[PDB]
Design a protein around this ligand. Structure first.
Ligand SMILES: [K+]
Ligand SMILES: [K+]
Lengths: 231, 231
């Protein structure tokens, strides 16, 4: 019996081993966001002296990295990254992911765009036949909130403006709102990502499909599976 | 002999006439940004009582509209717009435009997305055989500045971070930077818009091509020409 937390530790450790097996000494590591990514951070901390530091995908991740004395570089200082290690809210058989549930959509997608290899770390619950039962985050310019909402509704999506504990709109780092869209059945993630990216007022869509996972270390009740997807 | 300012007044007046000819009493008018759009604002002000008010594409436009006592609605309050009247930095034969030179890229593209009809108002200098000699504005998340720069450079573009008079980075309403990209020869604006929109870290690209002009009132030294483009 392994709890979800134990499966997350297991994939975090497995990703640290993937990095030490595949990424040479002195490298800068691209680092994701979320509870699973935090397990990877803690595991990577035990070999931190082998690497020059990290690029971070969120304030929360930067904070955790610094709590281990890991140097954090601004992505603008970095020309390339071999690896980016991050979770997913969902991942399908093509390696397309929904991400952004905890809000860091935009910076995750930026760091992922620079990295040669996206290593998804996930417990078994994240692997789904078809994306969309986890609500799709769409980061939007505030003046476009209802325009984008209408476009999502025309697809049968149920758009929910993300709110704080106090019921005022969650606002991201770039002064933007998030619409979490429910009820979509995303049988073609690449095509839907392209469509949503064509909408003025969309900042980032939490479909990582045109650039999805290159591999996934999936923590199951029978151990870690390594899933690989087409370059 | 008509100066450029006189040609801009001429198309502003022509667009006011287009609105009163085509947009019924009580409508809300979508309003662009820039010196040409300001001529249209001044002309529309003379028939302002015929319309309920306006949606604005910038702080500057909101200010000018209010200076005429025109009511300004937040786009989120508005379900549809018949018309959006705005300038362009350049427009080609397909009605594709480069816009954003004066910074309001993102809100212009949002309001344009809601309007059924985009009326471009421009003096004759704006009509070009091929887009790109006017630098292409790309609004970008700051952490993605160099990543997007590299992608533009790979196309032969020369990306220039927009700066204020004091040489600190211009920062937009959403806390974002602008890269003005020179040296592109944009023979397929729709294809390049789609490509740039697929880049994480891009907020808005100042190519209006997938949704371009529906018509253009072009102020020439022989009067206003009405150019029309495929729905
Ligand atoms: K997240
Ligand atoms: K502008």
């Amino acid at each position: 019996l392994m709890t979800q937390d134990e499966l997350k530790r297991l994939v975090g450790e497995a990703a640290a081993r993937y990095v030490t097996d595949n990424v040479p000494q002195g490298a800068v590591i691209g680092v994701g966001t979320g509870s699973t990514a935090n397990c990877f951070i803690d595991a990577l901390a035990a070999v931190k002296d082998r690497y020059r530091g990290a690029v971070s995908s969120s304030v929360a991740t930067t904070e955790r990295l610094k709590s281990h004395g890991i140097r954090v570089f601004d992505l603008n200082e970095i020309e390339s990254l071999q690896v980016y290690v991050d979770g997913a809210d969902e991942i399908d058989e093509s390696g397309a992911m929904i991400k952004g549930g905890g809000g860091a959509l935009t910076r995750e997608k930026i760091v992922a765009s620079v990295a040669e290899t996206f290593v998804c770390i996930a417990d078994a619950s994240k692997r789904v036949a078809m994306l969309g039962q986890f609500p799709l985050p769409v980061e939007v310019v505030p003046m476009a909130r209802t325009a984008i909402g209408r476009r999502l509704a025309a697809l049968g999506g149920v758009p929910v403006l993300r709110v704080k504990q106090d019921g005022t709109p969650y606002v991201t780092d770039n002064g933007n709102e998030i619409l979490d869209v429910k009820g979509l059945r995303i049988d073609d993630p690449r095509a839907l990502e392209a469509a949503i990216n064509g909408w003025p007022g969309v900042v980032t869509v939490g479909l990582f499909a045109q650039r999805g996972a290159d591999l996934c270390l999936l923590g199951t009740e029978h151990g870690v599976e390594t899933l690989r997807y087409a370059a």
